[PDB]
Design an enzyme around this catalytic site. Sequence first.
Site, PDB file in Angstrom:
ATOM      1  N   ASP A 166      28.348  83.956  13.443  1.00 25.62           N
ATOM      2  CA  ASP A 166      29.616  84.553  13.066  1.00 25.62           C
ATOM      3  C   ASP A 166      29.522  85.130  11.657  1.00 25.62           C
ATOM      4  O   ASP A 166      28.555  84.876  10.935  1.00 25.62           O
ATOM      5  CB  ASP A 166      30.735  83.516  13.152  1.00 25.62           C
ATOM      6  CG  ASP A 166      32.099  84.150  13.306  1.00 25.62           C
ATOM      7  OD1 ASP A 166      32.260  85.316  12.887  1.00 25.62           O
ATOM      8  OD2 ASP A 166      33.004  83.487  13.854  1.00 25.62           O
ATOM      9  N   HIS A 302      34.523  90.459  23.451  1.00 26.39           N
ATOM     10  CA  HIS A 302      35.361  90.078  22.310  1.00 26.39           C
ATOM     11  C   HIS A 302      35.306  91.062  21.141  1.00 26.39           C
ATOM     12  O   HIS A 302      36.344  91.503  20.654  1.00 26.39           O
ATOM     13  CB  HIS A 302      35.021  88.663  21.837  1.00 26.39           C
ATOM     14  CG  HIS A 302      35.747  88.242  20.595  1.00 26.39           C
ATOM     15  ND1 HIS A 302      37.123  88.173  20.520  1.00 26.39           N
ATOM     16  CD2 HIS A 302      35.285  87.780  19.410  1.00 26.39           C
ATOM     17  CE1 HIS A 302      37.475  87.733  19.325  1.00 26.39           C
ATOM     18  NE2 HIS A 302      36.379  87.494  18.629  1.00 26.39           N
TER      19      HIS A 302
HETATM   20  C1  HEM Z   1      37.817  80.343  18.414  1.00 28.47           C
HETATM   21  C2  HEM Z   1      38.101  81.628  18.626  1.00 28.47           C
HETATM   22  C3  HEM Z   1      37.157  82.699  18.245  1.00 28.47           C
HETATM   23  C4  HEM Z   1      35.795  82.726  18.371  1.00 28.47           C
HETATM   24  C5  HEM Z   1      34.930  81.621  18.928  1.00 28.47           C
HETATM   25  C6  HEM Z   1      35.350  83.989  17.886  1.00 28.47           C
HETATM   26  C7  HEM Z   1      34.001  84.373  17.843  1.00 28.47           C
HETATM   27  C8  HEM Z   1      33.559  85.563  17.282  1.00 28.47           C
HETATM   28  C9  HEM Z   1      32.199  85.941  17.195  1.00 28.47           C
HETATM   29  C10 HEM Z   1      31.027  85.109  17.654  1.00 28.47           C
HETATM   30  C11 HEM Z   1      32.152  87.167  16.601  1.00 28.47           C
HETATM   31  C12 HEM Z   1      30.911  87.980  16.316  1.00 28.47           C
HETATM   32  C13 HEM Z   1      30.438  87.771  14.875  1.00 28.47           C
HETATM   33  C14 HEM Z   1      30.656  89.009  14.038  1.00 28.47           C
HETATM   34  O1  HEM Z   1      30.587  90.154  14.540  1.00 28.47           O
HETATM   35  O2  HEM Z   1      30.894  88.880  12.821  1.00 28.47           O
HETATM   36  C15 HEM Z   1      33.486  87.563  16.342  1.00 28.47           C
HETATM   37  C16 HEM Z   1      33.830  88.748  15.745  1.00 28.47           C
HETATM   38  C17 HEM Z   1      35.162  89.062  15.553  1.00 28.47           C
HETATM   39  N1  HEM Z   1      36.264  88.366  15.919  1.00 28.47           N
HETATM   40 FE1  HEM Z   1      36.325  86.630  16.676  1.00 28.47          FE
HETATM   41  N2  HEM Z   1      36.408  84.708  17.494  1.00 28.47           N
HETATM   42  C18 HEM Z   1      37.536  84.001  17.655  1.00 28.47           C
HETATM   43  C19 HEM Z   1      38.861  84.359  17.391  1.00 28.47           C
HETATM   44  C20 HEM Z   1      39.240  85.606  16.899  1.00 28.47           C
HETATM   45  C21 HEM Z   1      40.565  86.059  16.794  1.00 28.47           C
HETATM   46  C22 HEM Z   1      41.789  85.242  17.119  1.00 28.47           C
HETATM   47  C23 HEM Z   1      40.519  87.354  16.298  1.00 28.47           C
HETATM   48  C24 HEM Z   1      41.665  88.234  15.963  1.00 28.47           C
HETATM   49  C25 HEM Z   1      42.742  88.293  16.741  1.00 28.47           C
HETATM   50  C26 HEM Z   1      39.145  87.682  16.115  1.00 28.47           C
HETATM   51  C27 HEM Z   1      38.678  88.875  15.641  1.00 28.47           C
HETATM   52  C28 HEM Z   1      37.312  89.117  15.519  1.00 28.47           C
HETATM   53  C29 HEM Z   1      36.863  90.368  14.904  1.00 28.47           C
HETATM   54  C30 HEM Z   1      37.755  91.458  14.361  1.00 28.47           C
HETATM   55  C31 HEM Z   1      35.523  90.350  14.935  1.00 28.47           C
HETATM   56  C32 HEM Z   1      34.586  91.424  14.418  1.00 28.47           C
HETATM   57  C33 HEM Z   1      34.620  92.662  15.330  1.00 28.47           C
HETATM   58  C34 HEM Z   1      33.847  93.823  14.741  1.00 28.47           C
HETATM   59  O3  HEM Z   1      34.077  94.221  13.577  1.00 28.47           O
HETATM   60  O4  HEM Z   1      32.991  94.425  15.434  1.00 28.47           O
HETATM   61  N3  HEM Z   1      38.403  86.630  16.561  1.00 28.47           N
HETATM   62  N4  HEM Z   1      34.339  86.590  16.796  1.00 28.47           N
END
Ligand code: HEM
Length: 446
Positions: A166, A302
């Site tokens: 992450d 995601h």
């Molecule tokens: C426990 C719940 C969650 C898990 C396990 C999770 C997991 C991850 C993972 C593994 C990544 C990829 C790492 C990265 O690109 O930096 C990521 C990216 C991201 N997550 Fe989550 N996430 C969660 C909840 C959320 C929530 C609630 C939001 C917003 C509503 C969110 C928004 C994002 C965004 C914006 C990115 C980067 C997307 C990008 O710029 O390409 N996440 N998340």
Amino acid sequence: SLNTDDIQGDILVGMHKQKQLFYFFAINDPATFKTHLASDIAPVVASVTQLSNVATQPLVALNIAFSNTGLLALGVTDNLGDSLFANGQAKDATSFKESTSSWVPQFAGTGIHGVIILASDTTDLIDQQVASIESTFGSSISKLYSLSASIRPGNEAGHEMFGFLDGIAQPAINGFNTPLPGQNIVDAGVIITGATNDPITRPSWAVGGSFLAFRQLEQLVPEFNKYLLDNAPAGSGSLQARADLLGARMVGRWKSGAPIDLTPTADDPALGADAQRNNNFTYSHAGFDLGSDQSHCPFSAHIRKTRPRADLGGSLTPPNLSAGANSIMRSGIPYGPEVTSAESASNTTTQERGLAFVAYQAQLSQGFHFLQQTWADNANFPPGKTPATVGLDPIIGQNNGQPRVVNGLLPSNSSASLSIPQFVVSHGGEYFFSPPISAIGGRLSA
Ligand code: HEM
Ligand SMILES: *[C@@H]1O[C@H](CO)[C@@H](O[C@@H]2O[C@H](CO)[C@@H](O[C@@H]3O[C@H](CO)[C@@H](O)[C@H](O)[C@@H]3O)[C@H](O)[C@H]2NC(C)=O)[C@H](O)[C@H]1NC(C)=O
Ligand SMILES: *[C@@H]1O[C@H](CO)[C@@H](O)[C@H](O)[C@H]1NC(C)=O
Ligand SMILES: *[C@@H]1O[C@H](CO)[C@@H](O)[C@H](O)[C@H]1NC(C)=O
Ligand SMILES: C[As](C)(=O)[O-]
């Protein structure tokens, strides 16, 4: 540009510590609280400047943020320009198709006046700093709830509980960050209230702050892993490989951090570890129709749901700059124990673990709230796809406790639906405002 001396560290660079405590408080005696806010807290609030310098890391990094009711308790009646913040997150739960039945009771209300974020490399240092704070403030403050969090152990450091690297992707702030390949570039005012091109009028004392959306998101890790094994696509690869593939298709990245868009069929750990490559993509591919091609990354993945890139127009070559105004800075950190032997064996969670989710943005309606409701929970986002039904975000998508229909995940048939139980359970949270450091011993102590 930004005065990084006056911006709280967690907003832009994170706390840079092994351990964090989120200490949620009420204010009982405003007069006494203010005295100690000015004398004892303000001077030790860690700035972006301080946390950006390797030689000036505090032993315990402290940040502080206030709910709407916290500001009112301080007699601060100014309009911060954010109705979602004013109403509080409990009122917003309907927007996300979730019930407060699963919420931490303390979150399900507006009794919490603020959060102190303590960060340090040991829990001992945090515990001692809590003792010092409580002794200083006395009965002028009440602890209502707290959540301990930590970077995961060993080679899993920097990975969240499902096992995925992450903290790769963040918006770059124009004029502040030097952008990495593929990284979005946004106005400071997207993240920092009163900063460049924030269109919303703020109180002057609030210029340099940010809205902190806190979410206690439990992750059902054994259940997730079992689902992957049980629903892994057929193929000539090993069962483990095909289960791993399905997991990566859901996230949009392999556990190493390698974006599946750039390596669709297997992990590439060298790529995952390389900040110069691991975000360098738009979702477009020569010879493929952006509107229907899910062979590189599902429309429902995601990261694709939360930053659509070329899905919302703009450049097909990196960097894609679409939807800058819907960027969030993420400062989340895992909480709870590692998965235990018995849980791994039974496929059944008994010990709560997950992500202490923290998003910063200047407008809640454009950031976290928008991503969750308008994109993640929207079966027809991104728009203009074939088939049109993308389904929900398999990680965070919510449907009132019902299984989520998620399409595109299986490479062999983009029309093939999976019905997926929730693997993330919201236990709620609150919307806070992290003020500029000057406001802490300034207006907020007056
Ligand atoms: C426990 C719940 C969650 C898990 C396990 C999770 C997991 C991850 C993972 C593994 C990544 C990829 C790492 C990265 O690109 O930096 C990521 C990216 C991201 N997550 Fe989550 N996430 C969660 C909840 C959320 C929530 C609630 C939001 C917003 C509503 C969110 C928004 C994002 C965004 C914006 C990115 C980067 C997307 C990008 O710029 O390409 N996440 N998340
Ligand atoms: C980020 O990804 C982009 C591609 O989206 C990378 O740019 C590409 O880099 C490759 C290899 O350096 C270039 O290959 C060249 O192709 C041209 C065809 O016009 C050819 O004449 C050259 O002999 C060479 O093979 C490719 O052109 C280039 N594509 C674009 C759109 O710029 C970039 O290198 C990546 N950045 C990092 C830091 O990895
Ligand atoms: C956990 O799930 C796996 C894969 O479905 C299965 O093989 C195993 O028997 C399950 N464990 C128990 C205790 O049922
Ligand atoms: C693809 O999935 C759709 C929806 O379930 C189904 O109707 C169709 O028969 C599938 N095609 C193949 C080749 O399995
Ligand atoms: C990003 As490409 C080399 O698949 O067009």
